């Protein structure tokens, strides 16, 4: 269970060389699912002493329809106002 490749590969104790001593290979220890990065952008930039990872998160993914409708009310009111202005013009 790792999020970062450097942390995952820094110290591996379940490598084939060590596992062959016991000759047991559990299915739950697949390298395919062993590590997986987050879904947010993360890029390295040169820091004072070494590369540092900066995360770029722009928008959330858990908004709900009540909030969206509350944010959209002004757009609907503006549409109605402009249409009424055209009709009265």
């Amino acid at each position: 269970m790792f999020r970062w490749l450097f942390l995952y590969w820094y110290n591996s104790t379940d490598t084939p060389s060590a596992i062959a001593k016991v000759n047991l290979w559990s299915y739950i220890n697949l390298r395919l699912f062993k590590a997986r990065l987050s879904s947010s952008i993360a890029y390295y930039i040169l820091g004072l002493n070494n590369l540092e990872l900066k995360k770029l998160k722009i928008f959330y993914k858990n908004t709900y329809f009540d909030y969206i409708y509350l944010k959209s009310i002004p757009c609907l009111f503006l549409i109605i106002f402009f249409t009424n202005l055209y009709l009265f013009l």
Binding site: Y43, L46, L48, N49, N50, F59, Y60, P74
Partner: protein, 383 residues
């Protein structure tokens, strides 16, 4: 001189990369968030300033117990005679939940007495439309009524009357003086108010903070939200009101807290004072009191460059230069790049542009070899 100290600040730990379990701060503190103690050594006076949202029985009984214990020389309450009469007539109510049923009845304290002249009628129309719009933007529930005094102030007044202590009424949030100031202010219109209210949240930070505060209010409830009300949250609400209506916010907050400070400082009967006021006025009153008394907490000056590890940066640069020189001398060549660690901001990896630290003016420039392996001796030391 002017003691221009931070006030109405809502940004918590701007120097910390908070997230997950590493929070910026704890907003939950029912007693400290609304209890403040101020001292005036010159006159030997003590003030217990309480910021009440009028929607917490816990805080109401805490204030009652504090008044009973302290036995103040005088009590100041931000209410009016009409509301006091209504509250005293109301009897046998001990919980804010029950008291909230009387909010509409107690809302009659907002007399807003004015004549029906032409100018006053136009002002009434504009003011009521703007009040409806601002209440729409507030979107507070019935449980949370910060501007309607309730159980806490009722208990304070009752205890003062029982102990025969002078009681000074400061008026509601919108009293006669505030209404006169609003009338003097001409910039008030429902349409412009709607425009500015829906244009105020101009940043994702502001939108997220607004959503967080209001979702917390809805989920937790009026009483729990009042208990968890924090200084930073109150400052954020003050700034949100500023953005919604700076001209009205000025009168309703800055001038109101200045008047309250005047009342509590210049015309206070006794030495011990217990003041109960709307919470968002506490920051301004506290700042004014501290500035007048010259009792501000001593804060050490912060150097804007004090948190930069210039030593670490220079040491890293020196180490990288030494490593490059050593590698170049070992390999009988020169460095491919002068970047300590590769980064993709400059497209040096796949473009002709390079990063080489070799600059000199003429053939006799002593700094000609700086950045090159020729600047180091056989022992890998600078020459």
């Amino acid at each position: 001189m002017i003691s221009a100290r931070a006030v109405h600040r809502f940004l918590r730990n701007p120097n910390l990369e908070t997230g997950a379990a590493f929070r910026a701060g704890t907003r939950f503190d029912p007693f400290k968030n609304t209890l403040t103690v101020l001292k005036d050594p010159q006159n030997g006076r003590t003030l217990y300033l309480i910021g009440t949202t009028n929607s917490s029985t816990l805080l109401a009984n805490r204030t009652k117990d504090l008044v009973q214990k302290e036995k103040p020389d005088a009590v100041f309450v931000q209410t009016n005679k009409e509301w006091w009469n209504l509250a005293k007539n109301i009897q046998d109510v001990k919980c804010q939940q029950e008291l909230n049923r009387y909010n509409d009845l107690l809302s009659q304290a907002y007399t807003l007495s004015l004549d029906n002249t032409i100018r006053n009628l136009v002002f009434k129309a504009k003011f009521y439309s703007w009040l409806f719009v601002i209440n729409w933007f507030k979107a507070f529930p019935d449980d949370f009524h910060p501007f309607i005094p309730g159980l806490e102030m009722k208990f304070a007044i009752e205890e003062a009357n029982k102990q025969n202590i002078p009681v000074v009424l400061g008026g509601l949030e919108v009293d006669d003086v505030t209404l006169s100031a609003l009338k003097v202010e001409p910039r008030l219109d429902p349409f412009s108010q709607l425009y500015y209210g829906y244009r105020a949240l101009h940043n994702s930070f502001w939108r997220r903070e607004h959503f967080d505060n209001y979702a917390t209010l809805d989920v937790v409830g009026g009483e729990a939200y009042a208990e968890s009300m924090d200084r930073f949250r109150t400052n954020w609400f003050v700034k949100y009101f500023e953005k919604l209506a700076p001209y009205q916010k000025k009168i309703i907050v800055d001038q109101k807290d200045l008047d309250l400070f005047y009342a509590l400082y210049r015309d206070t009967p006794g030495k011990k004072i217990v003041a109960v006021v709307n919470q968002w006025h506490v920051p301004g009153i506290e700042n004014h009191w501290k500035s007048a008394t010259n009792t501000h907490e001593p804060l050490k000056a912060i150097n804007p460059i004090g948190d930069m590890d210039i030593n670490k940066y220079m040491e890293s640069q020196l180490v990288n230069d030494t490593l490059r020189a050593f590698v170049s001398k070992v390999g009988k060549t020169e460095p491919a790049t002068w970047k300590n660690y590769s980064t993709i901001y400059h497209k040096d990896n796949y473009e002709a542009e390079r990063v080489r630290h070799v600059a000199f003016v003429d053939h006799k420039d002593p700094h000609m070899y700086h950045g090159l392996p020729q600047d180091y001796d056989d022992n890998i030391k600078p020459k």
